């Protein structure tokens, strides 16, 4: 509408350079160091990891590019899942 809408950001943002740093087959401490601590985590069953983008200046289209990681119960990455919209 017309009313002022304050800026809203509700996620962990990382640019494509850190996305390129992702590669399967390495521990958890390194990926936490590389992408930052996960602001999201599934607490049921699988201990998968989530990273999300929330960005909308106000009355404008939201920008979302999710990025998911799967870890077995051993401390090593299984697969990733990028999505830009």
């Amino acid at each position: 509408r017309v009313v002022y809408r304050p800026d809203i950001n509700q996620g962990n943002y990382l640019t494509a350079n850190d996305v390129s740093k992702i590669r399967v087959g390495m521990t958890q401490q390194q990926v936490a160091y590389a992408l930052g601590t996960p602001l999201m985590s599934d607490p049921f069953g699988t201990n998968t990891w989530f990273y999300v983008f929330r960005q909308q200046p106000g009355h404008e289209g939201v920008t979302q590019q999710t990025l998911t990681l799967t870890f077995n119960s051993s401390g090593v990455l299984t697969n990733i899942d990028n999505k830009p919209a």
């Binding site: 809203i8 509700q10 996620g11 602001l39 999201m40 599934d42 607490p43 049921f44 989530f50 999300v52 929330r54 979302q64 999710t66 998911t68 999505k83």
Partner: protein, 218 residues
């Protein structure tokens, strides 16, 4: 202002007029007696009466100071259950009582602090000495405080759902269900989690927590 006379009569008068309920004059007499008889034969009984007077006279902070003085004075007394219960009662009484009590306004979404402190104190009491005389009402108070804290967290999650910051809601309700899994607040907060997952375009988890509702249809 005070009679400097042998102690027997001042103790006797002190208990007699506390027995009347003259707290405004009893607190001064008791504090002067304690400060002039620091190590009398039964100064413990003096300190307990001071606790009683301070609580009933609604001077809660000084009562708290007297509590944490007594606990370190003798951490092993055959009546510490009463002191711990009085401390928890002081916390809870300090927490929630105002014009809202007359108006019946739900005091849920208010500043917890004292609520958390009271819960911790009462839990320490009940897990310490289950054979005491102050366990039943204590347990009921534990239940009530747990419900209050859960409702507070549910309220803040509800406001975030009203805004549209669909991540912090996930974290807050996850903390709720990790800490407070056995209360009504999570029971009506789960749909907020479902809504957040649906709006977050990551519905792979959404139906997952939806199955949770499938286990509590009632």
């Amino acid at each position: 202002e005070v009679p400097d006379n042998p102690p027997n009569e001042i103790y006797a008068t002190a208990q007699q007029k506390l027995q009347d309920g003259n707290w405004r004059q009893a607190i001064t007499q008791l504090e002067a007696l304690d400060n002039r008889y620091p190590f009398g034969p039964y100064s413990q009984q003096v300190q307990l009466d001071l606790i009683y007077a301070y609580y009933k006279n609604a001077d809660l902070p000084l009562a708290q100071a007297a509590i944490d003085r007594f606990i370190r004075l003798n951490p092993t007394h055959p009546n510490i259950d009463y002191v711990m219960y009085m401390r928890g009662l002081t916390n809870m009484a300090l927490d929630d009582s105002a014009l809202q009590g007359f108006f019946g306004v739900d005091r849920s979404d208010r500043d917890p602090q004292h609520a958390r402190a009271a819960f911790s104190d009462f839990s320490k009491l009940v897990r310490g000495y289950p054979n005491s005389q102050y366990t039943t009402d204590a347990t009921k108070r534990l239940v009530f405080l747990k419900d209050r804290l859960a409702k507070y967290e549910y309220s803040v999650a509800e406001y975030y759902t009203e805004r549209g910051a669909w991540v912090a809601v996930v974290n807050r309700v996850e903390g709720m269900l990790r800490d407070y899994p056995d209360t009504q607040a999570t029971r009506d907060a789960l749909p907020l989690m479902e809504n957040a997952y649906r709006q977050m375009q990551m519905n792979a988890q959404a139906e997952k927590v939806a199955k949770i509702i499938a286990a509590n249809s009632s």
